[PDB]
Amino acid sequence: TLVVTANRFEQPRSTVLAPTTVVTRQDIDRWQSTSVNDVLRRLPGVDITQNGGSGQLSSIFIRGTNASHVLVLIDGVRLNLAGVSGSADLSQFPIALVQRVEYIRGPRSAVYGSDAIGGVVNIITTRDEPGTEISAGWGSNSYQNYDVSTQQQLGDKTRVTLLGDYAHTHGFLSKTLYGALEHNFTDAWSGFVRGYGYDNRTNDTRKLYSQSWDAGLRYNGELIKSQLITSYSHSKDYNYATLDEMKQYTVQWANNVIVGHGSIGAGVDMQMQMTTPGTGDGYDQRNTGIYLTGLQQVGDFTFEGAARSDDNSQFGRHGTWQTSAGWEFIEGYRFIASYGTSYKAPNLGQLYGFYGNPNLDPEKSKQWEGAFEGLTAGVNWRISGYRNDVSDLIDYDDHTLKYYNEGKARIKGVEATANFDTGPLTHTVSYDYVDARNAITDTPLLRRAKQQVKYQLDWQLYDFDMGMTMQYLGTRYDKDYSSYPYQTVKMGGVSLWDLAVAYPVTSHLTVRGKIANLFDKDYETVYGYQTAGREYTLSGSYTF
Numbered sequence: 386t387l388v389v390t391a392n393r394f395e396q397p398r399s400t401v402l403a404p405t406t407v408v409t410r411q412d413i414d415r416w417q418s419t420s421v422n423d424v425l426r427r428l429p430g431v432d433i434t435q436n437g438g439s440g441q442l443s444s445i446f447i448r449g450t451n452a453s454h455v456l457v458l459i460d461g462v463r464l465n466l467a468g469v470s471g472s473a474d475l476s477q478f479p480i481a482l483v484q485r486v487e488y489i490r491g492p493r494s495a496v497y498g499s500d501a502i503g504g505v506v507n508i509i510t511t512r513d514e515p516g517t518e519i520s521a522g523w524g525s526n527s528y529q530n531y532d533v534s535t536q537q538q539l540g541d542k543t544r545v546t547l548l549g550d551y552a553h554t555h556g557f558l559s560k561t562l563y564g565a566l567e568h569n570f571t572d573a574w575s576g577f578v579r580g581y582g583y584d585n586r587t588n589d590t591r592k593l594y595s596q597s598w599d600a601g602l603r604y605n606g607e608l609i610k611s612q613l614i615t616s617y618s619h620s621k622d623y624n625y626a627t628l629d630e631m632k633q634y635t636v637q638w639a640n641n642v643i644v645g646h647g648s649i650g651a652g653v654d655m656q657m658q659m660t661t662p663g664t665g666d667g668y669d670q671r672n673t674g675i676y677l678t679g680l681q682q683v684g685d686f687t688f689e690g691a692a693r694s695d696d697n698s699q700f701g702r703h704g705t706w707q708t709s710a711g712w713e714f715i716e717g718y719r720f721i722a723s724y725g726t727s728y729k730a731p732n733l734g735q736l737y738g739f740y741g742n743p744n745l746d747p748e749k750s751k752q753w754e755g756a757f758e759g760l761t762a763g764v765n766w767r768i769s770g771y772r773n774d775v776s777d778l779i780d781y782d783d784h785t786l787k788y789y790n791e792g793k794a795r796i797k798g799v800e801a802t803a804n805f806d807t808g809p810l811t812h813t814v815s816y817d818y819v820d821a822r823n824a825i826t827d828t829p830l831l832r833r834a835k836q837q838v839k840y841q842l843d844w845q846l847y848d849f850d851m852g853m854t855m856q857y858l859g860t861r862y863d864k865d866y867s868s869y870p871y872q873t874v875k876m877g878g879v880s881l882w883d884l885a886v887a888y889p890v891t892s893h894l895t896v897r898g899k900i901a902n903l904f905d906k907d908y909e910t911v912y913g914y915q916t917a918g919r920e921y922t923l924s925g926s927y928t929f
């Protein structure tokens with residue numbers, strides 16, 4: 386029930402005035418997930434289209450927004466993937482590193498800067514769970530996974546985690562190494578060192594290497610909270626022949642204090658990107674931002690706010706803000722209103738590529754949102770409507786020879802969610818409606834399901850832990866490339882069911898079973914790229 390992402394500090398969800406979702410490891414081990422897209426598609430407002438199976442290019446669309454309009458943080462610390470030019474993928478990101486996910490929807494550019502429009506996904510790779518764990522998997526598609534993890538001090542003050550994981554099929558191979566050091570100076574002062582890298586091979590061949598190093602100091606006291614954090618990432622993406630290399634440096638400093646019935650915060654955020662020539666000659670992009678945040682509770686009312694100023698070495702200064710008010714009109718029920726502003730920064734290609742253009746400005750969004758949330762007869766629910774006007778979109782004029790700012794996009798959506806228990810059954814449902822169009826031409830965007838329905842259902846029989854997940858992906862427009870000109874089609878969307886089971890044998894030695902695409906239904910999220918739907922996975926874990 387504690388989440389950071391929102392304001393960079395620990396706080397209760399019931400305190401965040403905006404929809405959010407949290408995923409813990411335990412969930413991920415239940416769902417038996419081998420892919421970050423597997424753990425994301427299950428959540429509200431999210432749809433992921435992939436040109437095939439694991440390893441393949443995927444794009445994430447949050448609440449009908451474009452593929453690069455979501456912010457992926459890794460303890461964030463954004464996702465070592467400026468792109469390389471320029472949006473987040475997560476196809477090649479090792480599920481083994483994921484210990485938790487916090488996801489918040491709506492704009493948060495006013496804390497994080499450029500990139501937060503529609504959503505923020507914060508993939509965290511830290512944990513507090515001592516003991517060593519050796520696991521493995523064998524599935525039905527040449528899938529073979531082995532993993533070993535451990536966390537133990539070493540000190541009584543310092544603690545060390547080490548994990549190595551290996552996953553390939555037969556063509557996608559991933560190898561991953563992670564080590565960490567957590568030292569507590571006092572009962573309030575703490576620090577860490579983090580290093581990790583993965584080397585992936587994806588069959589034309591692709592070879593990507595990444596490595597990340599993070600170091601940080603934190604202070605959490607009775608009233609005052611502060612963090613100083615430092616990150617450097619190095620990715621090399623060899624395609625074949627091309628190479629993309631990006632080096633990313635980050636330094637940020639924030640503070641927060643408990644002033645009354647909430648807090649007030651502020652920090653400074655600096656980022657440097659070194660992109661190598663032919664990557665995407667070479668560019669060095671620099672961005673610095675400054676922001677302030679605030680949460681105040683006053684009698685049945687809630688107020689949460691952030692505002693930021695970014696100075697960007699190519700477009701200069703851009704400012705950003707957001708505000709929410711919550712009203713608990715009767716115990717258990719709340720009405721909530723939010724408004725927010727956000728931006729996406731021009732990327733290397735759009736800026737300095739074959740086509741223009743070095744003077745582009747950021748794509749800008751405004752978002753308004755209304756919501757009712759409640760606890761009723763044991764059901765925790767929420768329903769929101771939102772409207773998102775995006776403008777100064779960067780397009781390709783088709784004529785001169787360059788990118789410019791021109792198109793607009795309206796989005797109107799609705800999200801509803803509920804979780805509740807009946808028997809020994811737990812239910813977790815959501816519905817989404819995304820009406821995303823081109824505001825000028827008034828045609829549906831493309832690649833976005835107009836409706837999604839998600840249902841999860843968990844229950845224990847007899848020491849057998851069962852879980853069933855159901856998804857309806859609605860109708861999307863895409864393009865029939867096969868023939869030029871490429872025109873648009875309509876895929877009808879479909880239903881998928883997955884079934885996962887788990888048995889605790891003895892104590893440290895759980896055996897797990899999964900069946901994806903229960904009915905072995907054939908469908909595509911991206912026109913032309915066949916999905917792989919009929920896999921049996923069998924897996925285990927031993928703890929000691």
Ligand SMILES: CCCCCCCCOCCOCCOCCOCCO
Nearest residue numbers: 677678679680681688689690691692708
């Ligand atoms: C001390 C600064 C207060 C919040 C800074 C960022 C807010 C910018 O717009 C939000 C305020 O505009 C409407 C009023 O809402 C303010 C409530 O936010 C919490 C203040 O503690």
Ligand SMILES: CCCCCCCCOCCOCCOCCOCCO
Nearest residue numbers: 677678690691692693704705706707726
């Ligand atoms: C922490 C609170 C500060 C956030 C408030 C920002 C809201 C913007 O205020 C009014 C906006 O009007 C400014 C734009 O006016 C002209 C637009 O471009 C021309 C430059 O002046």
Ligand SMILES: CCCCCCCCOCCOCCOCCOCCO
Nearest residue numbers: 651675676677692693694703704705706
């Ligand atoms: C402690 C840092 C305070 C930062 C507050 C502003 C961050 C972004 O500002 C909100 C953007 O709204 C308008 C501000 O930018 C407009 C720039 O024009 C100002 C001179 O005309």
Ligand SMILES: CCCCCCCCOCCOCCOCCOCCO
Nearest residue numbers: 715716717718719720757758759761762
């Ligand atoms: C759009 C939001 C809808 C808000 C409707 C809620 C308004 C009233 O909420 C229900 C009031 O509580 C009724 C439950 O009855 C009391 C239950 O306690 C059991 C013993 O007293």
Ligand SMILES: CCCCCCCCOCCOCCOCCOCCO
Nearest residue numbers: 755756768769770771772797798799800
């Ligand atoms: C107050 C929460 C509403 C969320 C959807 C349920 C209400 C539907 O009532 C009328 C539907 O609105 C007509 C078109 O809906 C699309 C608008 O989506 C939200 C952005 O305006």
Ligand SMILES: CCCCCCCCOCCOCCOCCOCCO
Nearest residue numbers: 766767768799801802803814815816818
């Ligand atoms: C939603 C109608 C007004 C009362 C909302 C109750 C809470 C809804 O929880 C629903 C969980 O997901 C299923 C919702 O499906 C119906 C809502 O769809 C709105 C249509 O635009």
Ligand SMILES: [Mg+2]
Nearest residue numbers: 782783784785
């Ligand atoms: Mg002409």
